[PDB]
Structure 1
Amino acid sequence: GMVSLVVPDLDVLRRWLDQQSITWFECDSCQALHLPHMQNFDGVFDAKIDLMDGVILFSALAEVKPTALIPLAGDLSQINASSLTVKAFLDIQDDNLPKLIVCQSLSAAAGLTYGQFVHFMKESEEQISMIVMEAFANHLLMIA
């Protein structure tokens, strides 16, 4: 049948997460909707929903072992090639543990439907969790 096509803002996303019974919290310092259930996957210290220039991003963050940083940076092509949708890259700071970011995007500027968002939440959770769990099994990550 027919469905509403909507250009969403963060309130739309929050309501759509409630409609899925997916729990979210906020950071006071940050603009994302954080997803506590993703910390049930080993290696995940945070996961979140951002909205940035009309694109939705679901990302998960893992802390990387300093000794695995170089082998991981050398695995990035194969990790990115392993998923049709998910992408993985490193975020390295001078003040902190290096981070693996594993993320999927959904472009929202031409409108989305609720069902498209639901599918996104499920496909992303699956594809993201797979990469991060694999990295955890390969002894690359710190326990959260």
Structure 2
Amino acid sequence: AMGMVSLVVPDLDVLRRWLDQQSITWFECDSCQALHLPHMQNFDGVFDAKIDLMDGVILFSALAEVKPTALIPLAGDLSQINASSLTVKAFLDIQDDNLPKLIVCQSLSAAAGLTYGQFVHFMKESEEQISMIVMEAFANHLLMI
């Protein structure tokens, strides 16, 4: 037992405040509704990272660009990567016009309510699990800079 709490169903404004509470800086696309997190670019391989809220689910995602020569090998390793974390998911986003991306993300289901403490844990856990995947891909020479 940790006691009684009262749960909140957050909107994006609650999330801005809860991020401000933790001293986590966020920035905000002209082109999207995600809260972008500049500190995540400190991890080798990370080009962008953000918090989205959609259909009752908070998502924390990082994006890295993949070298063309590593794309087939990385696609073959996706099972092992997803199996390697209890909480983080990984997949490729491939377009004809861009460099292929590796998306690495964790969700927190919010529609039933959350405490602030649960959000904080999620931010900490996600950052740690995400950066592990992405740094290991970088160190294996799979990513551009």
TM-score above 0.5: yes
TM score, norm. by length of structure 2: 0.97
1:44-91: per-residue Cα shift (whole Å, max 9, x none)? 010000001000000000000000000000000000000000000000
How far 1:4 sits from its partner (Å)?
2.8
TM score, norm. by length of structure 1: 0.98
How far 1:2 sits from its partner (Å)?
3.3
How far 1:28 sits from its partner (Å)?
0.7
Quick check: 1:59 aligned with 2:61?
A: yes
Consecutive aligned runs of 4 or more in structure 1 exceeding 3 Å deviation:
none
SS at match of 1:26: coil
Tell me, in whole angstroms, the C-alpha distance in 1 between the residues paired with 2:127 and 2:31: 25
How far 1:118 sits from its partner (Å)?
0.3
Say how many residue pairs are matched: 143
SS at match of 2:47: strand
- Aligned-residue Cα RMSD (Å) equals 0.6
How far 1:3 sits from its partner (Å)?
2.7
Runs of 5+ in structure 2 lacking a partner?
none
SS at match of 2:53: strand
Quick check: 1:114 aligned with 2:78?
A: no
Query: What is the identity percentage for the equivalent residue pairs of Structure 1 and Structure 2?
Result: 100
